[PDB]
C-alpha cells in the first residue's frame, strides 16, 4: 500500500559515529535561532574545528557515537504498527526521524515525505516537555523549509508540540523508577534520594518566558504522584557550560551536596528525554556517578534506565498520535502563546503556519 | 468544653495598620534564616526606619493596612467549624494563629496553645508549595521557641509542610478563574493570556535547591488540566528587588512584553497565596494593572479573586487537617530532605523536630 500518514520524529540528533562530530558541531554554530556571532559564517567552522577533539572524545567514551537514532528507530517501528491498528482509517503510516543538526536533517525527511505523496504530516516532537531551544528549533526547521523552498506544502501538516503530563509516559517512567529502587540495597532504599535532572536553560532564555522549567516540572509532580510519594526527590539541572548564569541546581553540585550531608544514595532520573545520548551515558553515568561521586560519598549511585525499548514507551507514542488525529487539534493551545520577551522574528511566523493550515 | 486539637496557622503577616510598619520590617531584617548583615543587630533597626515612609505608602494605596489576619480568621473558623463534624474523635478544634513577623507571632501562639493544655498541636503552613523561606522559617520558629525555653513541648506535634494540588485548592482556583473570565467582553474570552503569578525567589536561593519553583509549577499544570486548558498561560515571578539576580520572568516585564507582542487581553492569577495582601492589591492592582499596562496597550486587564472567604478552601482546609490527623503523619516525605546546598545549621534541627516527635 502507499503510505497514507506521516509521523516526523523530531529531535536534536547526536554524532552516530566520531567521524560525525564536527558537521554536528558546525551546524549548531551556524543556527542563529541558538547564537548570535560575531562573523559567525567564520566562527562557526573554526569554533566547530577547535572543539570537535573533545567531544569525539566524549563519545569516544561511550562506545564511539550516539545511539539516539537507533532507539528513535525501534521506537518509531512500534508506533507504526500499533497505529495502522489504532486508526484503519489513516491507511499506512510512516515515521519519519529529523535530527535538527545530524542526518537525516528535518529538511531532508521533509523532502522525503514529500516524494511520498502522503496527504498528512504530523510533526511529532520528541521531547515531552516544549523549549524554545528544542521543539521551537525544529518546528522553526519546518516553517523555514517551505519559506526557503518557496513553495507550499503539498500536504496537510500539524504539530504534537508537547505533552509533559501524558498518562502513559507517566508510567514509564515510575516503571523504570521502582525497578531501579529494587536494585538498590533493601536496607537502603527508604533512604535513597531520588534526583530528578533536566538539560538545563541559560537564564537568558528562562527570563525570556520559556515554558520548559514549568513544564518539567509537572512531569516531576506526574510520577512523585503514581510512586505515592515514598522517596524525597527533588528536581536539578544538567549540561551547563560557560561563563553566564543557568537554571539551577547543578545536577553535580547536587550529588556532592547531598554526600556531604550524609545522604549518599542517590537514584538519578533523567525525566525530559527518552532514551540514551550523551547526557545520561557519559555525563550522568561517568562525569557524576563515576569520577566525581567517588571521591564524596561512595554508597550508591543508580540511573533509572531511559525508556528506550520498553514496548510501553511505544504504547505511549502511538496513543498520543492517535488521540491528536482523533481530535483534529492543529497543535497545543500553548504554542499559540509566543514568550512574553521573545525577540526572535520567526516564532510568531512558525506558530501561524501550524495554526493557519489547510483542514 | 477544653479544646483538645489546635491547629497552627502559619504566614509570614503583614502590617495591620500604618502603625506598625517599622516593628514589622525591624523583626524581619532581625531574621537570620532570610539575612546576614555586618551588625545586623545595629543595621537593621537602621534599615527599617529607613524604608518605613515607603512602604507605609504602599500600605497606604491599599486603605492602611494588611488584611491577611481578617481572611486567616474568617478561614481559621470556618476549618473549625467543619473539623467538629468530620474528626470528633478529636474533640473540639481550635485555630491559633503564628505570624512570623508581626502579632501574634509564632512564638507568643505557641504560648496560648500550651496554656490551654491542648493533646494535639498541628502546625498547618498557610504556603501551599514549600520555600524555605516562608514555610521552613515558620517551621524553625517553632524548633527554636522551644530550643530557647530549655522545656519540651507539653502537647503532641506534627505539620502539615505543603499541598501544593490538593484537589479542592485547585477547584478554587479555577472557579475563581472560570468566574474571571465572564468578567471579560465575551468577544474576548478566547483571547485571554493567563499570567500566573508568584513572589519571586533570587537564585542563591533557587540555586541551593529550593523546592518552590518546582512546586509552584505543579499547582499550575493541575489548575490548568481542571481548566482543560481553555485558554494559553505562562508562569512569572514578582517582587524581585536588589541588584542581584531573581527568578524570571518578571511579572511586570511579561504583562509589558505581551503588550507589545499584540496581546492586549490579560489575566492575572496569584497562585501561591490564598488571601489578598501588599503583592496582590499594591503590586498587581495598582503597580501593574493601574500604572503600567494603562501606558501600554490598553485593552483589559483582570486578576482572578484570591480566595479569601470561598467555604470552598474553608473545605480545603479541613480536608487537609482531618486527611493528615487519620493519615497519622508526622510530616512530608519530601520535609525529610533538606536543600542540597544547605547553607543554614537549623534546618537540620528543625527536620528533626518534626521527625522525631512522639508517635
Ligand atoms: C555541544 C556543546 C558543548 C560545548 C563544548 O564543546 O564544550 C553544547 C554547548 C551549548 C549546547 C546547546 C545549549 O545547551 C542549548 C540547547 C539545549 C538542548 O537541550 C539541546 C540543544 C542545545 C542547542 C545545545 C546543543 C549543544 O549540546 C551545545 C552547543
Ligand atoms: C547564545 C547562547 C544564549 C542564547 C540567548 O542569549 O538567548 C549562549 C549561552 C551559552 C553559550 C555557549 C557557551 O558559552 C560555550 C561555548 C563557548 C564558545 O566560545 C562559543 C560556543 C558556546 C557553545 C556558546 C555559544 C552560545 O554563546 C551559548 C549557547
Ligand atoms: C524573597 C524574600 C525571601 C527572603 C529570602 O529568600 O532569603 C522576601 C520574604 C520577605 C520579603 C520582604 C517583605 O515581603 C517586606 C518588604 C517588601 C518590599 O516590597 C521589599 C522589601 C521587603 C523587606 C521584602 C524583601 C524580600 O522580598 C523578602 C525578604
Ligand atoms: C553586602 C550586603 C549583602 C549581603 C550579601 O548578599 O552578601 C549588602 C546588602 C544590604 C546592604 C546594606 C543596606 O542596603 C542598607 C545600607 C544602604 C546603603 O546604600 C549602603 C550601606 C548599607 C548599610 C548597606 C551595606 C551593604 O551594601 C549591604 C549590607
Ligand atoms: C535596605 C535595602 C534597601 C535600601 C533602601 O531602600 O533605602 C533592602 C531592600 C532590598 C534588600 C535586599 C534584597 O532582599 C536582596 C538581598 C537578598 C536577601 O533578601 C537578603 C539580603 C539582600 C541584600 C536584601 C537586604 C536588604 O533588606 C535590602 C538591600
Ligand atoms: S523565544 Fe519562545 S516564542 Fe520566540
Ligand atoms: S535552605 Fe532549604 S533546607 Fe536549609
Not at 564536527?22 to 573554526?46: C, E, G, S, V, Y
Not at 550529588?255 to 532514551?275: D, M, Q, Y
Request: with cysteine.
Amino acid at each position: 500500500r502507499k503510505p497514507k500518514t506521516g509521523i516526523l520524529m523530531l529531535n536534536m540528533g547526536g554524532p552516530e559515529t566520531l567521524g560525525d562530530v564536527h558537521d554536528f558541531l558546525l551546524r549548531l554554530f551556524l543556527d542563529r535561532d541558538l547564537m548570535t556571532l560575531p562573523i559567525q559564517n567564520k566562527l562557526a567552522p573554526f569554533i566547530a574545528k577547535r572543539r570537535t577533539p573533545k567531544i569525539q572524545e566524549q563519545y569516544r567514551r561511550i562506545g564511539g557515537g550516539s545511539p539516539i537514532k537507533i532507539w528513535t528507530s525501534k521506537q518509531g517501528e512500534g508506533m507504526v504498527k500499533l497505529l495502522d491498528e489504532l486508526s484503519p482509517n489513516t491507511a499506512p503510516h510512516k515515521y519519519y526521524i529529523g535530527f535538527r543538526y545530524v542526518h537525516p536533517l528535518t529538511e531532508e525527511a521533509i523532502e522525503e515525505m514529500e516524494r511520498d505523496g502522503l496527504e498528512r504530516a504530523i510533526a511529532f516532537t520528541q521531547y515531552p516537555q516544549y523549549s524554545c531551544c528544542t521543539t521551537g528549533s525544529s518546528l522553526n526547521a519546518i516553517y523555514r523549509y517551505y519559506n526557503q523552498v518557496g513553495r507550499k506544502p503539498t500536504m496537510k501538516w500539524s504539530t504534537i508540540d508537547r505533552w509533559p503530563t501524558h498518562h502513559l509516559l507517566i508510567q514509564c517512567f515510575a516503571d523504570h523508577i521502582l525497578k531501579e529502587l529494587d536494585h538498590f540495597p533493601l536496607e537502603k532504599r527508604s533512604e535513597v534520594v531520588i534526583l530528578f535532572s533536566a538539560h538545563s536553560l541559560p537564564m537568558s532564555v528562562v527570563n525570556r518566558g520559556d515554558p520548559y522549567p514549568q513544564e518539567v516540572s509537572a512531569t516531576v509532580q506526574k510520577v512523585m504522584e503514581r510512586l505515592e510519594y515514598c522517596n524525597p526527590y527533588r528536581l536539578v539541572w544538567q549540561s551547563k557550560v560557560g561563563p553566564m548564569p543557568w537554571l539551577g541546581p547543578q545536577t553535580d553540585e547536587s550529588i556532592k551536596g547531598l554526600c556531604e550531608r550524609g545522604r549518599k544514595n542517590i537514584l538519578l532520573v533523567p525525566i525530559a528525554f527518552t532514551s540514551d545520548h550523551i547526557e545520561t551515558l557519559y555525563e550522568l553515568d561517568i562525569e557524576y556517578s563515576q569520577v566525581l561521586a567517588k571521591e564524596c560519598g561512595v554508597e550508591n549511585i543508580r540511573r533509572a534506565e531511559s525508556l528506550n525499548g520498553n514496548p510501553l514507551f511505544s504504547k505511549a507514542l502511538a496513543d498520543l498520535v492517535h488521540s491528536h488525529i482523533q481530535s483534529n487539534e492543529l497543535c497545543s493551545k500553548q504554542l499559540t502563546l509566543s514568550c512574553p520577551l521573545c525577540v526572535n522574528p520567526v516564532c510568531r511566523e512558525t506558530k501561524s503556519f501550524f495554526t493557519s493550515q489547510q483542514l
